Amino acid sequence: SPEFMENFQKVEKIGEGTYGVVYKARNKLTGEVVALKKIRLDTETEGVPSTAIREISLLKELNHPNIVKLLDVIHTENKLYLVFEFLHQDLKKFMDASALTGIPLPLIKSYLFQLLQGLAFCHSHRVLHRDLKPQNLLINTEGAIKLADFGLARAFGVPVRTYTHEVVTLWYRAPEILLGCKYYSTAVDIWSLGCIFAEMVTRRALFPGDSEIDQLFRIFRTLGTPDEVVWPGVTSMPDYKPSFPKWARQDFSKVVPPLDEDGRSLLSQMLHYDPNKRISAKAALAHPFFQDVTKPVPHLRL
Ligand SMILES: O=S(=O)(O)c1cccc2cccc(Nc3ccccc3)c12
Ligand SMILES: O=S(=O)(O)c1cccc2cccc(Nc3ccccc3)c12
Numbered sequence: 168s169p170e171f172m173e174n175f176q177k178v179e180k181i182g183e184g185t186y187g188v189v190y191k192a193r194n195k196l197t198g199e200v201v202a203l204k205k206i207r208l209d210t211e212t213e214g215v216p217s218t219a220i221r222e223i224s225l226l227k228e229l230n231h232p233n234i235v236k237l238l239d240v241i242h243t244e245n246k247l248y249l250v251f252e253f254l255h256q257d258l259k260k261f262m263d264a265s266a267l268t269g270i271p272l273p274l275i276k277s278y279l280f281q282l283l284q285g286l287a288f289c290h291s292h293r294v295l296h297r298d299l300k301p302q303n304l305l306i307n308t309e310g311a312i313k314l315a316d317f318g319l320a321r322a323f324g325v326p327v328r329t330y331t332h333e334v335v336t337l338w339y340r341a342p343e344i345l346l347g348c349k350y351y352s353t354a355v356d357i358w359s360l361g362c363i364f365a366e367m368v369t370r371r372a373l374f375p376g377d378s379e380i381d382q383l384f385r386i387f388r389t390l391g392t393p394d395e396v397v398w399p400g401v402t403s404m405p406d407y408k409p410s411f412p413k414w415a416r417q418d419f420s421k422v423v424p425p426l427d428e429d430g431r432s433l434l435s436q437m438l439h440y441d442p443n444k445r446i447s448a449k450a451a452l453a454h455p456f457f458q459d460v461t462k463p464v465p466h467l468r469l
C-alpha cells in the first residue's frame with residue numbers, strides 16, 4: 168500500500184546528513200515514528216543516470232543487523248523521500264552526552280565490533296560506505312549500532328553543501344584519498360572507523376581539519392609524515408608533494424592514553440598509512456581486543 172507524504176507528521180529534525188536535514192516523523196496512520204531522508208531530483212541534462220542507480224541497487228540489496236533498515240520509498244514530482252526505521256540517537260550525540268565521563272569501554276568495544284561486522288558484510292557485498300562519521304552511526308535502546316548515510320562513488324541527486332559533508336567528512340577521510348590515489352579500496356572505511364574508535368576513547372576528534380591540505384598535515388603531525396619505507400609508492404601519488412613538512416611519528420601512548428596494548432594494537436592496524444597493510448574488517452573481528460566483547464545496553468538520556 169503506497170504511502171504519501173501527507174501521511175507523515177514532522178516531529179523534529181534529528182540529523183544533518185549528506186542530503187541535508189533528516190527528520191523524525193510520525194506515520195499518522197500507524198502512529199509509528201520513522202526517519203525521513205529527502206532527496207531533490209534534478210531531471211535536466213538527460214534525467215536519472217543508470218550508473219548512480221546501480222550503486223543504489225547494491226545498497227538496496229544489503230540486509231544486515233548493523234545497517235539501518237529502509238522501510239519505504241516515496242516518489243513525487245522531482246523528489247524522493249526515504250522512510251527509515253527510527254533509532255534513538257547517533258554516535259555523535261551519544262559521545263557529546265558522555266563527554267564528561269566518556270563511553271564505558273565495554274560499550275566502545277561492542278560498538279566497534281558491531282561496526283566491523285557491518286562493514287565486513289558491506290565489503291563482501293561490493294559496498295563501501297565512504298563517508299563514515301559519528302553522525303551517521305545510529306544507536307538504539309537495545310545496544311545495537313548501525314551504519315547509515317552511505318556515500319555514493321557517483322553523485323546521485325542535487326548536492327547539499329553543509330558543514331557536515333564539506334568539512335566533517337574530511338576528519339575521517341583516508342590519506343590515500345587525500346593524496347589523489349587512483350581507485351581506493353574498502354580500506355578507506357577501516358581508516359574512518361579507526362579515527363572514530365580513537366574519538367570514542369579520547370572524547371575528541373582525532374584529525375579535525377578544515378581543508379584537504381590541513382587534514383593531511385594534521386595526520387602527518389600525529390602519525391608522522393609517511394615515506395617510501397612506511398608506505399611504498401606514497402611519494403608518487405597524484406597529490407603528493409616532496410615539499411610536505413616532515414613530522415616524526417607520535418606514540419599512541421600519547422595520542423590515545425586510555426588504551427592498553429590490545430587497543431593500541433588494533434588502532435595501529437586500522438590507521439596504517441599503507442592501505443595494503445591496513446587490517447580488514449573481517450580480520451579485525453578476530454583481534455584479541457575483542458576477546459571479552461559483550462552486548463551491553465547504553466545509558467541514553469535526552
Ligand atoms: O529504485 S527505487 O525503488 O525507487 C529506490 C529504492 C531505495 C532507495 C533509492 C535511492 C535512490 C534512488 C532510488 N530510486 C530511484 C530511481 C529513479 C528515480 C527516483 C528514485 C531508490
Ligand atoms: O540512505 S542510506 O542511510 O545511505 C541507506 C540505508 C539503508 C538502505 C539503503 C538502500 C539504498 C540507498 C541508501 N542510501 C542512499 C545513499 C545515497 C543516495 C540515496 C540513498 C540506503
Ligand SMILES: COc1ccc2c(c1)/C(=C/c1cnc[nH]1)C(=O)N2
Nearest residue numbers: 181184202251253254255256257316
Ligand atoms: C542519514 O541517514 C539516516 C537514515 C536513517 C535514520 C537516520 C539517519 C536516523 C538518525 C537519528 C539521529 N538521531 C536519532 N536518529 C535514524 O533514526 N534513522
